[PDB]
Design a protein around this ligand. Structure first.
Ligand SMILES: NCc1c[nH]c2nc(N)[nH]c(=O)c12
Ligand SMILES: NCc1c[nH]c2nc(N)[nH]c(=O)c12
Ligand SMILES: [Zn+2]
Ligand SMILES: [Zn+2]
Lengths: 365, 365
């Protein structure tokens, strides 16, 4: 029932477990957020997303502002009613996908203009318009509009981009705050930049803390630097952020990356023929599964593993059948939610370090 | 609980309503059978197919004998356990799709040899092998292997093909009967041929009745002759079949075709951006639905119409999202099951002629 309340129930090292309370529901942390692109978590009904244990989903902004359009979604009642998900939704700012999926983008201090990847339509995106679009969609957790930094990045370019990002973070803060219904009902997260440079991460964290946000993302990672480098940067970056607010690592979702990131103080993650299993991923298209009657994973509690075999799913995926996508997706998102649950429980019980060890021994065996 | 028992509970004119009792369940007639191709009713879990009200599904034989293979399905426990549908399955003989989807087919009195449409693999299909494959899949209702007749067809060619079909019907009968487990647990339907020729339909019906089957299909229609011609042929063809056994019209599923066919004594049908509504079909991709908050149909009891709007489904289909296929398919199969229910109830209440009238007035308004 409050607009936003993050409470930490238990800790182990840098790891934390707790809850974020919002108007539309409670979010258990560490949290994994399935991703909705074009107002759908691909191949799943929202009731099925919920059934896997998800407390919140991410809505990509870029595709919705192109199709079906933010204004139209607002006229139709907002994203939650449009897609039939009534729990929190975190929306991205749209900047990532502009720069990664759009064309003829022209960047400047005001923002970015671009042509979409689908048509030739002209479009504009600034801190102000991004916050507006997230409002029109009815987002619960709004992300500040930033300027991401390619990897690798020179210190000068990483600095310029981080600085611009902090200027846009203030503009984001003010746009959000000047819209009463959004300010009163949603939350706003700021994004830390700085590439792999500690001094720049520090300056960014300081700037963001000065402005003040409900949560802080670590942006700029998982863009080519490798897990070792990513963890090294997290080692010094996450402590710079306010302890008492949630920490979201953008673009990170491999099971092992999630475990090590939680070990480094991260609280929120998203979804980035592969099936996850506690013994490591499998590619279900491999011929070795064509007569395998076992479920995708031997322990998994999901409906898919209760009800269908590897052999059947192998057949469906090789045949390009939609049910194959449906089943593979339900299992994988369930597997991630079970990972998060095991993480939450082990932290609450002060045995997370052990969990991490055990998980890795078997997942890479 | 018996292998096969068809009981007629009520009649109106040539229309009948009742039940087929089989080991795996009861089938309400007139029945609409969703089609499973490659061991899946496209984009639906079997629990969802059931939820729409389906009592039985059709399994296409052709694709399964190519992928995943009949022998493999039998090793894995049969089609019902492979795909997770535990109720009756009617399997087609595979002949239709050979001739329509395969290559280098060489026909003869023994059967057909062909190369599949996917690979270059060589294959053979006779009455005996078709019955064997249906057994390997664990079919509850087995279709005799026939030689369908192109439309239009000359009387000589229609006669030759019908005669061959009756010879193969006997071979089908004997193959089925000589396999104890199949004979004791499954049912066998024969197929009437003869194109649009009354004398040939009569000879075929006689031949099939002499051999004896658990049910009789009307084959050879819905292959280009138009609804008027189709109904004209049904007018004289269906009475030639045994009254006390079910009558299956192959390849017929338009809602109006179903109503008129039931009016002519047919008991079983199958599935052949279009959404069915009681006011006629709509194409949900039309721009007129982009901000339409109404459900696909205003009366439909399905989960889709409870939970999502035209506008949302329009968006999903235009975006090529899998959930769009999922939702459109669940609604359409539910709509057909509701049509069948209204048909069964109106016959039981002696008001089917009125239902038919009313249905057509509004569906074509
Ligand atoms: N590189 C991490 C990442 C993934 N998606 C993101 N989107 C934005 N706007 N910024 C970011 O840093 C990220
Ligand atoms: N033309 C009706 C039809 C559809 N599918 C069928 N399959 C076979 N084997 N014979 C048939 O007559 C039909
Ligand atoms: Zn599973
Ligand atoms: Zn419906």
């Amino acid at each position: 029932r409050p607009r936003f309340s993050f409470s930490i129930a238990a800790r182990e090292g840098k790891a934390r477990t707790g809850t974020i309370e919002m108007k539309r529901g409670v979010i258990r942390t560490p949290a994994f957020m399935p991703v909705g692109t074009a107002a759908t978590v691909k191949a799943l009904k929202p009731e099925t997303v919920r059934a896997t244990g998800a407390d919140i989903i991410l809505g990509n902004t870029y595709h919705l502002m192109l199709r079906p359009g933010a204004e139209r979604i607002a006229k139709l009642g907002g994203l939650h009613s449009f897609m039939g998900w009534d729990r929190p939704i975190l929306t991205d700012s749209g900047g990532y996908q502009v720069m990664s999926l759009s064309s003829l983008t022209k960047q400047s201090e005001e923002g970015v203009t671009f042509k979409s990847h689908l048509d030739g339509s002209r479009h504009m995106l600034s801190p102000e318009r991004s916050i507006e679009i997230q409002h029109l969609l009815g987002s619960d957790i709004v992300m500040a509009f930033d300027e991401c930094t390619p990897y690798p990045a020179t210190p000068s370019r990483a600095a310029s981009s981080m600085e611009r990002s902090m200027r846009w973070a203030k503009r984001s803060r003010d746009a959000f705050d000047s819209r009463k219904e959004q300010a009163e009902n949603a939350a706003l997260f700021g994004i830390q930049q700085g590439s792999v440079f500690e001094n720049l991460r520090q300056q960014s964290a300081d700037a963001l803390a000065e402005i003040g946000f409900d949560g802080y993302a670590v942006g700029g990672l998982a863009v080519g630097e490798g897990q070792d480098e990513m963890f090294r940067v997290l080692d010094f970056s996450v402590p710079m952020l306010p302890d008492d607010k949630p920490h979201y690592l953008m673009g990170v979702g491999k099971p092992d990356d999630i475990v090590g990131a939680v070990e480094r103080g991260i609280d929120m993650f998203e979804c980035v023929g592969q099936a996850f299993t506690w013994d490591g991923p499998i590619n279900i298209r491999n011929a070795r599964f064509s007569e395998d009657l076992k479920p995708l994973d031997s322990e998994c509690h999901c409906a898919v593993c209760q009800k269908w075999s590897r052999a059947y799913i192998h057949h469906l995926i090789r045949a390009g059948e939609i049910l194959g996508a449906m089943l593979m997706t339900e299992h994988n998102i369930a597997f991630y939610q079970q990972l998060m649950q095991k993480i939450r429980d082990s932290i609450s019980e002060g045995r997370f370090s052990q969990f991490a060890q055990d998980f890795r021994a078997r997942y890479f065996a």
